[PDB]
């Protein structure tokens, strides 16, 4: 709701260009963040427009980090740096 509140700002200008990043506990809800996107439930989170534009971020994207750091621990340290 607030993201949509920010997108509907009006000062003099419009608030659509304002940078917004939103945490989501459910990756499905990303469809409501933007209106130009083609709402395809089959499409995974990474292919969604808000995620591709760097305006949405869930924690499911960090689930593969377990496998990534199992196959190579060093990369995790890189993130820690």
């Amino acid at each position: 709701l607030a993201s949509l509140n920010i997108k509907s700002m009006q000062f003099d200008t419009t608030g659509v260009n304002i940078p917004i990043i939103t945490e989501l506990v459910n990756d499905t809800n990303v469809q409501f963040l933007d209106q130009d996107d083609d709402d395809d439930p089959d499409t995974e989170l990474y292919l969604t427009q808000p995620f591709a534009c760097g305006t949405a971020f869930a924690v499911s994207v960090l689930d593969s980090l377990m496998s990534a750091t199992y196959f190579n621990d060093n990369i995790l340290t890189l993130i820690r740096t």
């Binding site: 949509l4 509140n5 997108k7 509907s8 469809q31 409501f32 209106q35 709402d39 395809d40 439930p41």
Partner: protein, 339 residues
């Protein structure tokens, strides 16, 4: 898997019993041979495992009888073990899972939200009213709960207009199924008799958010139980209320009726009778009911003023616009036109 395993057991038992019967038991020098065909043995297996036990075809050999006993026991045990899977598999049936067809030259609307028997019944009574002109707009419904039997009977009574579909409003597939894009407007009902009305208001907010996400240019009529929730609803980028995105807030409207009747007694009842489309009924016995029914027969209508009444003469016409037209009417808005 269950069908294949049942068929395999059936055929294997039929073959084994056919082999046993067509070759008599060795204890009597193979003198118990019975002319039984394989398909007759299949028929015997069916008539002995459905428990029908016709007794027309029987297993005469001792080995045949022994295996018949043991494998009746085993087959009944296996069927009893498979009962839970049969029970759980059958229960999953779909009541009205389908899609809506767009009839050319026909308008239609879709209703979502809190759907119950009483709410739907009241909505149909208010919508499909005989006194109002012929209502030709198809009515489509949608809910996450399968319709009840009496709901299906009611929809059968209104088979011409009303037709149910099953789905979730938040799912774009369901919205595309009932052709949300082609509908004139979408109606969202709210559970006024629900615990914690804030949760219901927020739920309706999500419903309208999803509908606007699918199709920004759709007319939305929704019910809000608070005013701060209405202000929240105003914040949606596509929530343009200028041309018909009306949000009927029951709480503030009802309290306003109460306050207006406080200002002038009996105002709420006259407003409610005016807005409600009531079929006028005339009774003969001389009571106040006759006059009350005559007073509530009046309804509400709107129309844009004509050329003769539009040239800098709105209130002056409003002085005597009524005796010759037998009606009553009230820049931005028309409220008590004066001088």
């Amino acid at each position: 898997n269950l069908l294949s395993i049942f068929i395999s057991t059936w055929l294997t038992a039929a073959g084994f019993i056919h082999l046993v019967e067509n070759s008599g038991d060795p204890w009597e020098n193979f003198q118990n041979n019975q002319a039984l065909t394989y398909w007759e043995c299949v028929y015997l297996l069916m008539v002995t495992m459905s428990t029908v036990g016709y007794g027309d075809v029987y297993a005469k050999t001792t080995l045949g009888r022994l295996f018949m006993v043991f494998f009746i026991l085993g087959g009944l045990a296996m069927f009893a073990s498979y009962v839970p899977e049969i029970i759980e598999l059958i229960g999953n049936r779909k009541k009205y899972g389908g899609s809506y067809s767009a009839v050319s030259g026909r308008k239609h609307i879709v209703v979502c939200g809190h759907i119950t028997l009483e709410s739907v019944s009241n909505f149909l009574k208010a919508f499909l009213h005989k006194a109002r002109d012929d209502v030709n707009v198809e009515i489509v419904f949608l809910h996450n709960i399968s319709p009840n039997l009496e709901l299906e009977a009611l929809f059968k009574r209104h088979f011409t207009q009303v037709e149910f579909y099953q789905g979730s409003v938040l799912n774009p597939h369901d919205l595309a199924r009932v052709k949300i894009e082609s509908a004139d407007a979408c109606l969202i009902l709210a559970n006024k008799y629900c615990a914690d009305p804030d949760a219901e208001d927020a739920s309706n907010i999500m419903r309208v958010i999803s509908i606007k996400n699918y199709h920004p240019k759709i007319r939305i009529i929704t019910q809000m139980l608070q005013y701060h929730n209405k202000a929240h609803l105003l914040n949606i980028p596509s929530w343009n209320w200028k041309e018909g995105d009306d949000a009927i807030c029951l709480a503030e409207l009802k309290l306003g009726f109460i306050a207006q009747s406080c200002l002038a007694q009996g105002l709420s009842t006259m407003l409610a009778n005016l807005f409600s489309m009531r079929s006028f009924i005339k009774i003969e016995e001389d009571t106040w009911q006759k006059y009350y029914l005559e007073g509530v027969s009046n309804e509400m209508y709107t129309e844009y003023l004509s050329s003769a009444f539009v040239g800098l003469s709105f209130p002056t016409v409003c002085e005597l616009c009524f005796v010759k037209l037998k009606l009553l009417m009230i820049s931005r808005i028309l409220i008590n036109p004066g001088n």
